[PDB]
Design a protein around this ligand. Structure first.
Ligand code: HEM
Ligand code: NA
Length: 334
């Protein structure tokens, strides 16, 4: 854990060379198109973000401080409908188990029956509590555990052949809101997305997710861009960030424009049968990213050729020409 970084104000967030090397670059081809890009979420590539189900990295402490700040200002970024309380406990169990198993230097879990002992040495938390008893924790169980894991989480109720967004912790969204989407179904919350409905992508994706079973979780990557390493790109806070999209110039692309990648986990929760959706969000500046000449060239092509409805949906319009011009310098064939 490096010294405390900000994702707001002075934006002191930066990647080490190791964090650059393991950034989940999300483009398998020189152009991007939506698809059902799901795979089994099996451990692979030691040191990579695909090694564990829940990835904890050098920015862990920084990110939990940012989450704490978002929540100080807006506690309503976390919602658990009453029927999702058991799902919220399942979530806490799954996170604590995996974290204590995968990062034993930082986390520990000892249990006897519902008497649990959790230590988070990274954040200096030493908690004896009762599993299932919300009065034994200093807050609601989803909020308790997600204040201690990177990325966002939605918790979906599976009923009536559909998935409903009935709980979550959403403090670093790519321009959407859990309070808006609360209680929506899978096609409904995806209603703003261009093209993918007509292509069948959301039909097929629902069908795959509905069949996810215990111990066979699934993953995919999503991506966008963000000006500055701003994690809280929410509607709630638009006045704080939306105007930065007007500040990009040919001289500052490399410092301002960041590639934002979500490593998404879909895992069946065993007591409730709810589906956990982990949104693990990574940020990299274009200066950092162009370290890697292959990534630079490929990003140039992707951004040059991206369908305009996708570009526009992703919020990249206002600065896209400046960006493409900048990136062209890293593409010899162009
Ligand atoms: C329970 C699982 C999921 C949740 C909670 C979720 C949630 C969301 C949300 C809230 C958005 C933003 C919509 C907006 O603009 O307001 C979104 C966008 C999107 N989702 Fe999902 N989603 C899930 C699973 C899937 C899967 C499996 C796919 C498979 C292809 C997918 C594809 C997309 C696409 C293509 C976009 C637009 C993203 C972009 O262009 O950057 N989602 N999702
Ligand atoms: Na393809």
């Amino acid at each position: 854990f490096k010294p405390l970084e900000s994702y707001r104000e002075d934006f002191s967030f930066r990647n080490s060379p190791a964090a650059i090397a393991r950034f989940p670059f999300p483009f398998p081809e020189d152009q991007y198109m939506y698809s059902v890009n799901l795979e089994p979420a099996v451990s692979r590539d030691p040191g990579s973000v695909f090694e564990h189900q829940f990835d904890v990295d050098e920015h862990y402490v920084s990110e939990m401080a940012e989450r704490a700040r978002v929540l100080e200002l807006d506690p309503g970024r976390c919602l658990v409908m009453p029927h999702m309380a058991q799902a919220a406990w399942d979530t806490l169990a799954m996170l604590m188990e995996h974290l204590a198993r995968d990062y034993p230097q930082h986390f520990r879990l000892t249990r006897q029956g519902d008497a649990w002992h959790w230590q988070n040495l990274a954040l200096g938390i030493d908690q004896r509590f009762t599993f299932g008893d919300p009065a034994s924790l200093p807050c609601e169980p989803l909020e308790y555990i997600t204040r201690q894991m990177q990325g966002d989480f939605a918790v979906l109720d599976q009923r009536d052949g559909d998935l409903f967004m009935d709980a979550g912790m959403v403090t670093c969204p790519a321009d959407w809101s859990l309070r808006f989407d609360a209680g929506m179904s899978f096609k409904q919350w995806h209603s703003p997305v261009p093209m993918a409905h007509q292509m069948g992508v959301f039909d097929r994706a629902l069908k795959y997710l509905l069949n996810i079973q215990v111990g066979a979780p699934v993953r995919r990557l999503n991506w966008t861009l963000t000006i500055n390493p701003r994690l809280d790109t929410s509607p709630e806070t638009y006045h704080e960030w939306g105007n930065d999209r007007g500040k990009v110039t040919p001289d500052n692309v490399g410092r301002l424009v960041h590639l934002r990648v979500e490593l998404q986990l879909m895992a069946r929760l065993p007591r409730s049968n709810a589906l956990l959706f982990g949104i693990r969000t990574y940020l990299i500046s274009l200066d950092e990213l162009v370290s890697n000449p292959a990534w630079a060239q490929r990003l140039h092509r992707v951004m040059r050729d991206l369908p305009d409805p996708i570009a526009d949906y992703k919020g990249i319009t206002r600065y896209r020409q400046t960006l493409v011009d900048w990136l062209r310098r890293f593409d010899p064939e162009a």
